Design a protein around this ligand. Structure first.
Ligand SMILES: [Zn+2]
Ligand SMILES: [Zn+2]
Lengths: 328, 113, 328, 113
């Protein structure tokens, strides 16, 4: 039957990569990786298209949104007729329309955002619990959301549950693709996360800033480049490393990638986990470990509390006490 | 640009002057990255206490351009992103320019999806 | 009505790029560019998705193929239910399903391939004429076909009709994106084409080489990267240059781009038009200008004739006469 | 690899020897590019007449690896693709390595869509 043939044809295409080109390639590990996509926008759609072509069978979209009239040209699982409908479940249905064997699921779930008042403590407690369970259930988490503050809670929960996070983010003509570090019990080495590179706790960036539509005002090329690199980073990362290097059968496994369209460039970068980071600092980890949701609810409503806990307040006070000479 | 202001031979001198007229100080040029969406900063030159960390210097920049707390940036030194905990002294040692100054750019962090 | 809102919403998204970010950006030039896509495979599909998001209104697909069972996961305008159906017209219909105002057309047309016997001189004469007319009708030609020999005739015809060609090609883990040079009547400077980089006339590469499916055995990421870069190259190229440089409001306009996934890199390159090139050599241009189809039919069946005309045979004979010392 | 065969100080010498023992000759190391799908070539070293063009040298490589006519390659010199009409002498002048040899790699041309 047609579906069996589809299944065998995609399977053969993949097998040939191993048989004919890279005998050491592990295809099974990729096929069986359960993927959670946080965000079903331009990134979530393009990332999912790259994953299914690599043979990934289980993809779960999390998005609380609906399809807008401007979306289909940029968000590649939606059509004009879809406008107004809930995104996440449509994205899942769209994947199955491409390849009906997909275990594709969609969940209309809001991620609690740091810096925003809790509107309904109980309902958001449930959102938190649901998010933690989805994270725990899956193997690789793509962080593909659309603000600074939306990246905080998922970064923390993924670190807590010891899952690999691939975080991708866009600007008008540039992009960032990185893998977050994880905690190693014996090794004192750990790679940076998205929040390790500045010195402010994430907070409400949205209630204030006008022009809603600017978050999708980007050169169309950036979403496609970022999405494709994020997936290829995942496939390489899933391979075993060669003995004396940071490379696999698929090549490099960079910590961090930043690309720019204006000069057609790509930089490979690496940063260590920062002791005062408001997401991955050991003090923040410790606070979560002690109180769980009772700590998180405090941080959600009081971002400055994170700066106290992680030590950011200390290093900034030190600059305040310098005196009038880091100027003219 | 600053480096495009013609003064190479003068720069090495201005960098030497600073090396003597001031102690525990890092001469730094800090400018907005091209094409990056982020407020400008006209004051680009700095004598930075060598014992400050990168993160403390980032704080100084944030205040100088009057960036609000809800927006983040990152900095590049020679197309690398230095560790936030690193001492400016160690950064200066590793990345200092031929002309004696440490060149840094700052850019708005990406957030869209 | 919903369609009017779709139209205004996509339009606003684009306008904001100019109003808020790049006041000198010319959006109209991009919207009104008539695009011919030679090939509706993994490149043709992803390139078309990037174009519509940039506001391009007229896209015409040329492909003589049908949707195969392995195609939908990699070729992003097709669904499982489409398998067996003619590709080009389906691709056009798929674009309209995304954004119904698209002037999208598909043409099931075979491109005569150099090195292959003419099976029906008359029918292929018509294919040639139809291809030349489509090329003449459009503004920018994307060369997105799947062999060396399929790139020859369209490269020649586009040069003849003075159209901009953007040529993209994939390997297992690398890709090439380049713009072909055009003839300048006054300037003796001209950029290279795809055929300028080696010293053999294109010929039949297909009748012989087994494993049909290897032409789609590529890391899924390469098609997305190449497609996105090809389109961003086009949008920059369409902008006016600044006085003292090779740059526009959108940044660089590189001749040639080659990217590699194994080390996440991208090279920007430039080559000049090669005097012995079997596609763009002035002697080949002159031969076409004199006899048109009567010259082309000769070259199609006798690739070695191109090597004689362009002078490739001469430079190779010179190496033959060296004697036994370019060895040990 | 060849450059990874330990002999830097020896290379500059082997490059000097060639500069004297031979005239109108360019010392060249030519190897298959990593990850590129293209037949290997065990013989990697060449003394190339300086008046040959890049395209003539490409022809030499094609024959050496016994590549069929229907398949194309391209070459890189220092991550650049040299003009096919350029003299190997001019290429050598521009791109010659510290050790006196000109390093070239060859790769199969991309054709898929
Ligand atoms: Zn961190
Ligand atoms: Zn040419």
């Amino acid at each position: 039957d047609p579906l069996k043939i589809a299944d065998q044809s995609v399977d053969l295409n993949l097998k040939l990569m191993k048989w004919r080109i890279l005998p050491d390639l592990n295809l099974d590990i990729i096929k069986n990786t359960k993927v959670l996509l946080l965000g079903a926008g331009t990134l979530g759609c393009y990332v999912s298209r790259a994953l299914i072509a690599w043979g990934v069978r289980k993809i779960t979209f999390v998005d609380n949104g609906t399809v807008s009239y401007s979306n289909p040209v940029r968000q590649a699982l939606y059509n004009f007729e879809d406008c107004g409908k809930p995104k996440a479940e449509l994205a899942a249905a769209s994947l199955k329309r491409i390849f009906p064997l997909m275990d594709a699921t969609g969940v209309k779930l809001s991620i609690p955002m740091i810096g925003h008042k809790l509107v309904n403590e109980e309902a958001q407690h449930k959102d938190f619990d649901r998010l933690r369970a989805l994270i725990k259930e899956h193997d690789i988490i793509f962080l593909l959301v659309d603000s600074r503050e939306s990246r905080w809670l998922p970064s923390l929960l993924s670190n807590i549950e010891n899952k690999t996070v691939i975080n991708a983010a866009l600007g008008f003509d540039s992009y960032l693709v990185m893998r977050h570090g994880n905690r190693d019990e014996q090794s004192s080495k750990q790679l940076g996360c998205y929040f390790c590179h500045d010195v402010v706790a994430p907070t409400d960036s949205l209630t204030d800033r006008t022009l809603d539509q600017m978050s999708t005002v980007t050169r169309p090329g950036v979403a496609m480049m970022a999405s494709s690199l994020a997936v290829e980073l995942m496939t390489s990362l899933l391979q075993t490393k060669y003995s004396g290097s940071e490379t696999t059968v698929l090549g490099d496994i960079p910590h961090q990638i930043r690309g720019f369209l204006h000069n057609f460039s790509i930089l490979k970068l690496e940063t260590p986990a920062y002791e005062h980071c408001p997401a991955c600092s050991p003090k923040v980890i410790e606070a979560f470990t002690d109180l769980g949701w009772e700590f998180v609810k405090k941080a959600l409503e009081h971002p400055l509390y994170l700066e106290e806990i992680s030590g950011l307040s200390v290093i900034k006070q030190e600059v305040e006490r310098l005196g009038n000479d880091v100027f003219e | 640009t600053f480096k495009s202001e013609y003064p190479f031979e003068k720069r090495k001198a201005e960098s030497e002057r600073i090396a003597d007229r001031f102690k525990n100080r890092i001469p730094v040029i800090c400018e907005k990255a091209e094409k990056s969406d982020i407020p400008e900063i006209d004051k680009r030159k700095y004598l930075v206490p060598a014992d400050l960390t990168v993160g403390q210097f980032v704080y100084v920049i944030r205040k100088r351009i009057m960036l609000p707390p809800e927006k983040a940036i990152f900095i590049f030194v020679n197309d690398t992103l230095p560790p936030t905990a690193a001492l400016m002294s160690a950064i200066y040692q590793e990345h200092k320019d031929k002309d004696g100054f440490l060149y840094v750019t700052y850019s708005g962090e990406n957030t869209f999806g």
